[PDB]
Amino acid sequence: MVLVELTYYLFFIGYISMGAAFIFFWTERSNVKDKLPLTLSGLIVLIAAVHYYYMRGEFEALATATSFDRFVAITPIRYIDWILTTPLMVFKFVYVLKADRNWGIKLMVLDFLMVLTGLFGELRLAEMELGSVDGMRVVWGTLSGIFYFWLVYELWNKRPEGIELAPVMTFQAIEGDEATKAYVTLLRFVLIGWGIYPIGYLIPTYFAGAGAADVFDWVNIIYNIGDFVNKIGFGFATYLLVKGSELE
Ligand SMILES: CCCCCCCC/C=C\CCCCCCCC(=O)OC[C@H](O)CO
Ligand SMILES: CCCCCCCC/C=C\CCCCCCCC(=O)OC[C@H](O)CO
Ligand SMILES: *C/C=C(C)/C=C/C=C(C)/C=C/C1=C(C)CCCC1(C)C
User: Domain of life, per the record (predicted)?
Assistant: First the structure.
C-alpha cells in the first residue's frame, strides 16, 4: 500500500508543481517585450498540470485493480501530454536561439516520431500475455530510441565549439555567452533528463513477469519524476539564463 500511496501523492505533487510553475511563468511574461518563450514555458506546464490532475483521479479510481491495469489505464494520457508538450519545448529552444527554422522543424518532427512510435509500443501492453515479451513492443521501442538518438545526434552535431561530452555529462560550469550556456543546458536535459524515459520503458517490456509485484507503479514514479525535472527544471533553467543575458 505504501508504494501505491507514494505513487498517488507524486501525481498530486506533479499537478500542484506544474500549476505553480504555470502561474510563475505566466506572471513573468508580463515584464518582457518578447513574451513568446515564457508563453511557451507556461503552456507546457499548464498542459502537464491538466493531464496530471486527471491521471491522479484515474489512479485513485483503480486503487483496487492491479498495478498493470493502473498503468495501462493512465499511460496513454501521459503520451498525449508528451506529444503536445515536447514539440513546444523544442520550438522554444530553437526560437530563443534564433536557429535555422528548417532545422528546428526537423527536430520537432524527430521528437514527434519518437513519442508516436513509443505510443505504438505502449498500446501493445494491453494486447500482451504477461510473462511474454511482445515483438512489436520491442520493435516500436527500438524505433523510438532511434528517433531519440537521431534527435540527440542533430543537437550534438550543431553544438558550439569547445563543448565536449565529459564536461556536459559532469555538470561543469561552461564558459560562454547565453547561446553557448543555453545549448549546454538543453543538451544536459535531452541527454540526461530525457534518458530516464527509455529506462522506464524497459521495465514493462522485459520485467512485467519475473515475479516482481508492482513494477508498474515504479514506472509511474520514474515517469512522474522525469516530467517534474524535465518540464519545471528546463523552464526555470532557461528563464534564469534569458534573464541573465540582458546587456542593458
Ligand atoms: C517529488 C519529485 C521531485 C523530483 C525532483 C528531483 C531533483 C533531481 C533528482 C533527479 C533528477 C536527476 C537527473 C536530472 C537530469 C536533468 C538535470 C539537468 O539537465 O541540469 C541542467 C543544469 O541545471 C543546467 O545546465
Ligand atoms: C541491461 C539493461 C538494464 C536495464 C534496467 C531497467 C530498469 C530496471 C529497474 C527495475 C526493474 C526491477 C525488476 C525486478 C524483477 C525481479 C523481481 C523478482 O525476481 O521477484 C521474485 C519474486 O518475489 C519470486 O519469484
Ligand atoms: C515533458 C515530457 C517529456 C520531455 C517527455 C519525454 C519523453 C521521452 C524522451 C521518451 C522517450 C522514449 C524512448 C527514447 C524510447 C522508448 C519509448 C519512449 C517514448 C519512452
Answer: Archaea
